[PDB]
Design a protein around this ligand. Structure first.
Ligand SMILES: CC(C)=CCc1c(O)cc2oc3cc(O)c(O)c(CC=C(C)C)c3c(=O)c2c1O
Ligand SMILES: CC(C)=CCc1c(O)cc2oc3cc(O)c(O)c(CC=C(C)C)c3c(=O)c2c1O
Ligand SMILES: [Cl-]
Ligand SMILES: [Cl-]
Ligand SMILES: [Cl-]
Ligand SMILES: [Cl-]
Lengths: 115, 116, 116, 115
C-alpha cells in the first residue's frame, strides 16, 4: 500500500477511531471521482486503500469526516470535514502517509513521503 | 468584517504575503458557487471579503492557493491547496477569523468564532 | 512592543483568556533569571512585557501556564505548560510575536519575527 | 516501553532522523534530573527510553534538540529546542507516545496515551 491515513484526537490524546473518509481522483472534466474509502482502526489508521498499480500519477483528495467524529463525542465542531488534496507520484511511486491531528476548531495535516 | 483569513509561513517565521484564495458557498442544488476572492496583504491578512448582510447562513469553502505560494519561493510542496469547509451563521451572525499556518508538507488551520 | 504572545483555544474556537505566563532570560552563569510576566487579555494577547532597550540579545524562555487554563475549564490536560525557548536579537533588534494554539493533549507554537 | 517519541519534519515530508533528545525527571529540589536520552531512528522514532518499573509517577521533561537538526540541514531555526513537560501515570501506568512535528519557526507536539 502506497497510501495510508492516520488520524489522532488532540482532545482525548488518542487515536481517532471509526473515522470515515473517502479518497477521490480528479477526472479529466475536473470532477472528483470516488475510488476508495474506509474508516480508521483502533490504532487510528486506514490501510489498504489502493495498490501500487492503481495509484497512478494524478491529483487526489482525501475527505475525512471529522464532523461525524466530533458529533459522536458530543463536542461542537467547526469544520464540515478535513480535506487533503495533493498530486501523487510526480517523481515516481512513493509511499504516502497522511496524518491528521484533530481538534474541534482546528486541524493539522502532514504528509510523510518515503521509500 | 464577518470573515477574515490570516496566513502564516512556518519556514520563514513571517506572514504569508500575496497568497490567493477563493471562497465558495454551497447552493441549493449542492454545487459550489463563487462567493468572494482576494489575496493576502503584507500582514498575511485578507479583509473585506463580505458583509454581514451578504454572509447569510450556509456552508462555505475557503480554498487557499498554498501551492503557488511555495512554488514562487522555489519549493515544490505537498498540498495543492488548503481547504477550509464550514457551516456559518447557523445560530445567528458570527465573526470568523480563519488562520492557516503553512509548511511545505503540512498545514494547520484554526477558526476563532466571536459573537459580534 | 518587541515581544507579544497570543494564545488561542482550539476546543472552543476562541482566544485563550487569562492565561498566565512567565518569561525568563538566561544569565551569564547559565541560570534562568526572571524577566517579565503577565496574563492574556480578552483578545488572548499579552502586550507590554518589555521594551526595546531592555530586550537585549540573549536566550529567552516563555513558560505559558496551559495546565491552569484547562483545569479551570474542567479539563485535565497532558502538558504542565507550553515552553518557548529562543535566541532573540542576535542580528539586531527584532519584533517577536509568539503564538500558541492549545488543545488538551496537544499544542503548537509559532513565531513571527519582523524587522522593525 | 511505556514512553516512545516520534519526530517528523514538515519541510521535507519525512521522519526527522538522528534528532537527539534528553528526558529529565523533576527532583524534590525542583531541579531536572537527567535520566534517559537517545537519538531518533530512520523512522523518526526513539524507543527503549525507560521501563515500566522505573517510569514511576512524577513530572517529566523531554527536551528535543531541534536546533541542531535544522543546523544540519542548513535552515535557520527559531527555537533552541522543543520541550515537552508532563505529569506521568497520574491514574496508573499508561503507554505514552509523544509526537513532535517540526518546522523552522513552529512546532507542534501531541501525546497519545493508550493501554
Ligand atoms: C511513514 C513514517 C516514517 C511516518 C508517518 C507517520 C506515522 O507512521 C505516525 C505518525 O504519528 C503521529 C502522531 C501524532 O500524535 C502526531 O501529532 C503526528 C503528527 C501529525 C500532525 C501534527 C499533522 C504523527 C505523525 O505525523 C505520524 C506520521 O507522520
Ligand atoms: C505580526 C504578524 C504579521 C503575525 C503574528 C500573528 C498574529 O498577529 C496573529 C496570529 O493569530 C493566529 C490565530 C490563529 O487561530 C492561529 O492558528 C495562528 C497560527 C499559529 C499556531 C497554529 C500556533 C495565528 C498566528 O500565528 C498569528 C500570528 O502569527
Ligand atoms: Cl492554524
Ligand atoms: Cl484570532
Ligand atoms: Cl504534533
Ligand atoms: Cl501515534
Amino acid at each position: 500500500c502506497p497510501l495510508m491515513v492516520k488520524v489522532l484526537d488532540a482532545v482525548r490524546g488518542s487515536p481517532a477511531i471509526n473515522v470515515a473518509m473517502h479518497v477521490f481522483r480528479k477526472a479529466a472534466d475536473d470532477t472528483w471521482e470516488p475510488f476508495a474509502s474506509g474508516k480508521t482502526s483502533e490504532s487510528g489508521e486506514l490501510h489498504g486503500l489502493t495498490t501500487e498499480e492503481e495509484f497512478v500519477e494524478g491529483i487526489y483528495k482525501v475527505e475525512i469526516d471529522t464532523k461525524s467524529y466530533w458529533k459522536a463525542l458530543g463536542i461542537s465542531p467547526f469544520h464540515e470535514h478535513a480535506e487533503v488534496v495533493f498530486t501523487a507520484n510526480d517523481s515516481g511511486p512513493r509511499r504516502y502517509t497522511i496524518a491528521a491531528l484533530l481538534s474541534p476548531y482546528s486541524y493539522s495535516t502532514t504528509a510523510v513521503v518515503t521509500n
